[PDB]
Amino acid sequence: RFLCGVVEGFYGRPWVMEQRKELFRRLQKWELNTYLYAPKDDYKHRMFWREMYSVEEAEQLMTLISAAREYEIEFIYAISPGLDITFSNPKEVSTLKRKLDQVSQFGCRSFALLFDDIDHNMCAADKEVFSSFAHAQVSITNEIYQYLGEPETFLFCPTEYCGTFCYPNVSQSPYLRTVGEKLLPGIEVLWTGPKVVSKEIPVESIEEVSKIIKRAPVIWDNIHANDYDQKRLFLGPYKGRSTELIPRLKGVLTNPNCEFEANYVAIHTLATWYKSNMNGVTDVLYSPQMALKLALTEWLQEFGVPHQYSGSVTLEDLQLLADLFYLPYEHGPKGAQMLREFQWLRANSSVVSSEKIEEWRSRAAKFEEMCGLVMGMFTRLSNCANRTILYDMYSYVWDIKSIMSMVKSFVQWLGCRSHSSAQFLIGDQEPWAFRGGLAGEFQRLLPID
Amino acid sequence: RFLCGVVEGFYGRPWVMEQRKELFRRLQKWELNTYLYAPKDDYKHRMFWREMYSVEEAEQLMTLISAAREYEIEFIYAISPGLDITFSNPKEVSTLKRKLDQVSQFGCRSFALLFDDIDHNMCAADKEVFSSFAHAQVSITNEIYQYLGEPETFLFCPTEYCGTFCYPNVSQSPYLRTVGEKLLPGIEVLWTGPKVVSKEIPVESIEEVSKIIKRAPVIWDNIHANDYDQKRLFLGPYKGRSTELIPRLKGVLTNPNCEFEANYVAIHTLATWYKSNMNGVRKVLYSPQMALKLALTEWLQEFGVGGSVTLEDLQLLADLFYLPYEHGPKGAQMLREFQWLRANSSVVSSEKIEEWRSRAAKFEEMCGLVMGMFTRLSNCANRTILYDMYSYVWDIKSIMSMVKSFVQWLGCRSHSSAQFLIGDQEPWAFRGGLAGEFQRLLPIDGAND
């Protein structure tokens, strides 16, 4: 039993039920088998957890679970009470029991309770009754696990769910020691990696946290998570994770972008990565570039379902789009090539000599060709017939077009200003000082590398 | 008489029909009377305008027109033929006639021809039949206008509508002379301003346009439109417009933000500019500050069901996202305080450093006010208003917290190391993506020769 699926786990704009039914269709085509419902800004889930659903909310949740059971996807209703809860008071425990009982009647078999992004200080009665935070949380998890008759897949996310959040280490922390000692063995734990956003989840960190919890954890994976930076978007493949982590784990649950239609690659490459191996003890039987190419090919076929009726987008346009928006700690090959060409062009911009003028103007012409490629990419993407995918990522491609036009203008200005032929950079483009709207001003007034 | 209303005329995701009915309810509540439907990223309006409506969206447009007529708002179905239109081809004119005629059979009574961003001239036989491009546009506008038997309100938007678009000057341009002579009266024109964002439309620019168009223009407002960057919104007043423009104009149409729920303040302050100030003809009196206070009071009344949001939070929110050019008083105060502190940064922790610490204490207090504004706005009952503007308040929250940590490092500059915090966020994990990196590498005023 392996829990390979998608956790909705971001902040702000939760998905709609039609999007989740399309997600359940998408997982069943890709042989994935789980879905963890935990949207942080759904107000019946986090900010108010004592409040019960209405009749229409129960109906849409009931048909959501029915669509999941139709599509062989294990719906896991999670619930995060940790912002305001008295664990010592049994009234909050019984209210949580009532809420989990009402969601039991909607057809849910798998459940979870989540304790994330909360301060480590407790109440006065919680400090009076119980010794530490982890003892109270593991007593709540054991009480809910006994109250629901020990479900087959129950998930528990700790407050120190990554390597930076736990102190002093992953092994000397008293929190993970209490969690590993006092927990029932059928309850799977959640984990993220060395950070909240992990560049890599190495094998040895998984093995030492499997020592400290005495179980194989399920990695909540915020690789393509979009909630911390809403100016960014990630369309890279499922990289940074070795294929030998599958026998050392109980599940991989990816937390994708806040926009649903930008998540074809981020779930399909996870499906290809899970299809690499399933058992047995720079990567063997998995290439992230080949999984990225397969994801973009199937996504181009998704684009071609309405095609052009009611130029079209090509595969090279999608590859440029994925290379422009790749990873929280990486860019694409084309994006890094454009970065190093612009850094070269602004290096010797002030003094350019002969053969030096020849190579400068040739690489400036190559940069203008790449700028025309991104203009053609945006124009062919805006002429597509799948309108929902266009509306989900219109701000990002609009922002990269509106930046790259002025970058193309400044490279044309530098081509003018290599020789003494008057002009000004102000006369080429107006030097605006209001990008971001008092956020980019503070961002540019803050130091970078 | 006067066409004071809202043009839904941006790039991005167009609004759904139910929030358009909510918009019609708000326009009925604020004594506005117009709505210019022209969403530029719609696959039936701008591109593929020749395609007839389907058998499931025709009833949606019919119910939208009937909901407009219920609240006594003039639905103006604009159409943008200017992508691949052949003006001299009569079959294209017949397809345009059938397309407008099927909206005329949907109950729509006002129509508009829109010619934005088509300033490229005609070609082959199209360019030689007509003497100028404007002659072709006013001839097909007169043909459509007499085909419909002269409707009461018809709007012709040229491509030379911006003051910098008209070449040369305003009066010396041949386009505005051809439009002002060879177009029939009763077809009112659309004029944005001396700029495309229109910081200040004065009386004299309106006189210089009205002497060449021989009528009064209905003024387009991109004063709160965020379709050019989509990284900020605008909650400011209707600043930059004299009260005496109402007898010299035929209408004012406001293009608001692409997020619908952030448009309460801008449309309401337009309403307090019009219906509370000089409805009559009078050939300074409107206070933008009191209009902003009234708009924020009514928006606070919208915000109720209880997340305890106060009016100081909304004044702070409107000051954080204020105008395309200006900022709020509190936002400019925070920016000038932060640049004073980063200019007068203490080497170690007499007179200078004490005043520095006092201003740093006030700065961290108002940063905590920003945090309180976000955490009270996240607890509001009406979730859709939160979901529309979540990215902007999240961005300003995270940027304000990093700026507060940088001020905390600046208070102990000799003691602490690795700048603000070494937490693998020195590029803020490449904030903005490639758009942010190329924007920071653009020489606005830092590397400006």
Numbering used by the authors:
A (entry chain A): 59 to 339, 370 to 398, 551 to 593, 601 to 696
B (entry chain B): 59 to 341, 372 to 393, 550 to 593, 601 to 700
Please quote the paper that reports this structure.
A construct was designed that lacks the large, disordered loop (residues 397–535) while retaining the pHAT domains. As with TaOGA, this hOGA construct was expressed and purified from E. coli, imaged by cryo-EM, and processed using CryoSPARC. Both 2D and 3D classifications showed particle classes with well-defined catalytic and stalk domains, but none of these included fully defined pHAT domains. Instead, these domains appeared as blurred density in 2D and as an elongated asymmetric density between the two stalk domains in 3D, suggesting that the pHAT domains adopt a range of different angular positions relative to the catalytic core. To further explore this heterogeneity, particles were sub-classified to enrich for more populated conformations. This analysis yielded four major conformations—termed I, II, III and IV—each separately subjected to 3D reconstruction and refined to global resolutions ranging from 3.3 Å to 4.0 Å. An AlphaFold3 model of hOGA was used to guide model building, and across all conformations the catalytic core consistently displayed a near two-fold symmetry, forming two glycoside hydrolase active sites composed of the catalytic domain of one monomer and the stalk domain of the other. In all four conformations of hOGA, the cryo-EM density maps reveal a discontinuity in the region following Leu701, corresponding to the linker connecting the catalytic core and the pHAT domains. This linker (LFFQPPPLTPTSKVY) is of medium length and proline-rich, characteristics known to disrupt secondary structures and enhance conformational flexibility. In contrast, our hOGA cryo-EM structures containing the pHAT domains reveal defined, albeit at lower resolution, density for both regions, suggesting that the presence of the pHAT domains stabilises these otherwise flexible regions. Unlike the crystal structures of hOGA without pHAT domains, all four conformations display additional density in the active site. Superimposing a crystal structure of hOGA with GlcNAc in the active site suggests a density compatible with GlcNAc, presumably co-purified with the enzyme from E. coli lysates.
